[PDB]
Design a protein around this ligand. Structure first.
Ligand code: NA
Length: 540
């Protein structure tokens, strides 16, 4: 029903290689399918040449594993080989003043190792990608990047916000602005920031944190040229989220709100084989396409995957993301309206600034009417069937149900904060190492027993900005629990993880279609962000 943004024939040929690859290997020896979509064509061969050779090699119906592997190393450069290390111009081993507020000498010295990992995550798109981009699925980019880590060998959209928060702590403002410049280039080329900087991501976006990245950088550097460039591109991205399939209207007892909606109704190329098997239970092609669109839409939500998006959890195949008006998404567009109104006021466009002020107040009242649940003491996703109805609220408990606390008109409301503090301390989401993303152990990675850095930060930051003392103490307690568990994990394995098993201190999290991943961009950023805000006493 919705549009479908086509991918490049390089991507579609690499899916052929991937499908051949995972048929050939034994079941437990299944490789990561993404390492195939991340290949690039080895010079001087062309695509047609490589495809002809592949067609000759595959004229027999599986392929011997050793024959396949020989083809891979002959015609392709490995995954990540077109992504080269880059020494950030603004990196310094120990920055002057870095976490100077952190008394505990052991905590601060660990944090400087964490800060040292910006060098590992720092890399740059090779000159082949810029000169002959048709040979790569890596997209070309104006500036060096910070990647999440490990299998995520490209820059991602919403990761970069919490990365940028850490880069500020690390005093790496040029690297931080380089990420924003890269992301603005994607808005300019495509009209929206891609899920990540790969050709198989041109069909969808991610939670829209661009305006927050520009804001947090401006708030420190007061770079008025960055704001002036950003405004036309943010106006574009705001248009993208409030029109087309992304816009929904909910009439009350009319509010314009947004939903995720990927422009894709096929197996995700990076996971093509897995998605095809996931959908094999549907009998018609329309049912497969609707399911694939909800899978891809869950990818665009950033939370792939969770019982949050399942119509009948924990059944993966009831994934229904396009039916969900999500709390956190509309938190981020409320922020977008506050951010643009600020940047227009600052750049001498008080007329535009008032448009977005009224925008923000309409969404603030959509929040109370549509998402808020007084009896729950939290905000709830609204599931579509249009006009509102109480049973359409998803009453299950998620950390994203508490994301509005991040918003200043919310956390400035002393009475609201108190209702939210109690609802959250009684929710059961608070766990030994931080905040559980949900209460259902589903085997997915965005579910219990896991907790996630971006959700820790939004709640801690929000609670900490209130004037309510119990919120402020709960916020610090969560941050220290998160920091501690990340320290224990780091001492055990020498790395920082994508997500934590917050049910146990010192344990990283797993689940989902791929193995636990390390680096890890927003995890490092939140650790540094929390330490800059709260410090660590030497007596602790
Ligand atoms: Na994600």
């Amino acid at each position: 029903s919705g549009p479908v943004v086509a991918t490049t024939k390089l991507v579609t040929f690499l899916q052929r290689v991937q499908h051949t690859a995972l048929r050939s290997y034994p079941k437990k020896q299944t490789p990561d399918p993404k390492s195939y979509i991340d290949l690039s064509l080895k010079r001087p061969y062309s695509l047609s040449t490589i495809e002809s050779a592949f067609d000759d090699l595959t004229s027999e119906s599986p392929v011997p594993v050793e024959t396949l592997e020989k083809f891979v190393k002959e015609y392709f450069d490995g995954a990540g080989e077109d992504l080269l290390h880059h020494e950030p111009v603004d990196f310094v081993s120990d920055p002057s003043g870095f976490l100077s507020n952190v008394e505990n000498e052991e905590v601060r010295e660990w944090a400087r190792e964490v800060h040292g990992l910006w060098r590992n995550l720092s890399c740059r798109v090779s000159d082949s990608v810029r000169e002959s981009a048709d040979r790569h699925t890596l997209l070309p980019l104006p500036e060096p990047v910070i990647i999440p880590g490990s299998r995520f060998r490209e820059v991602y959209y919403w990761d970069s916000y919490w990365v940028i928060k850490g880069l500020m702590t690390s005093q790496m403002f040029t690297t931080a602005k380089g990420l924003v410049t890269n992301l603005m280039s994607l808005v300019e080329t495509y009209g929206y920031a891609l899920n990540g900087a790969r050709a198989y991501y041109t069909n969808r976006s991610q939670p829209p944190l661009l305006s927050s990245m520009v804001y947090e950088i401006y708030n420190v550097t007061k770079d008025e040229e960055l704001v002036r460039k950003a405004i036309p591109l943010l106006l574009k991205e705001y248009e993208f989220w409030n029109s087309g399939k992304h816009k929904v209207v909910i009439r009350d007892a009319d509010h314009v709100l947004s939903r995720y909606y990927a422009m894709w109704n096929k197996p995700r190329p990076e996971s093509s084989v897995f998605d095809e098997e996931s959908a094999s239970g549907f009998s018609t092609m329309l049912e497969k396409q609707r399911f694939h669109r909800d899978i891809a839409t869950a990818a665009e939500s950033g939370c792939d995957f969770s019982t949050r998006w399942m119509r009948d959890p924990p059944n993966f195949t009831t994934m229904a993301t396009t039916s969900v008006v999500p709390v956190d998404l509309n938190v981020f567009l409320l922020k977008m309206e506050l951010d643009i109104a600020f940047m227009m006021k600052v750049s001498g466009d008080q007329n535009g600034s008032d448009r977005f002020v009224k925008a923000s107040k309409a969404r603030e009242k959509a929040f109370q009417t549509v998402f808020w649940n007084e009896k729950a003491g939290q905000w709830l996703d609204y599931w579509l069937s249009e006009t509102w109805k109480a049973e359409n609220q998803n009453t299950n408990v998620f950390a994203s149900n508490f994301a509005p606390i991040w918003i200043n008109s919310i956390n400035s409301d002393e009475n609201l904060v108190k209702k939210v503090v109690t609802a959250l301390k009684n929710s059961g989401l608070i766990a030994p190492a931080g905040i559980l993303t949900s209460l259902t152990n589903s085997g997915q990675q965005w579910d219990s027993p896991n907790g996630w850095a971006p959700q820790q930060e939004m709640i801690v930051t929000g609670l900490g900005r209130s004037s309510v003392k119990e919120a402020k103490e709960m916020a610090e307690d969560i941050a220290r629990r998160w920091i501690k568990s990340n320290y224990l994990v780091y001492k055990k394995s020498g790395t920082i993880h994508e997500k934590l098993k917050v049910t146990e201190l010192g344990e990283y999290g797993g689940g989902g279609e791929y193995m636990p991943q390390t680096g890890f961009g927003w995890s490092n950023g939140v650790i540094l962000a929390f330490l800059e805000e709260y410090g660590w006493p030497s007596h602790l």
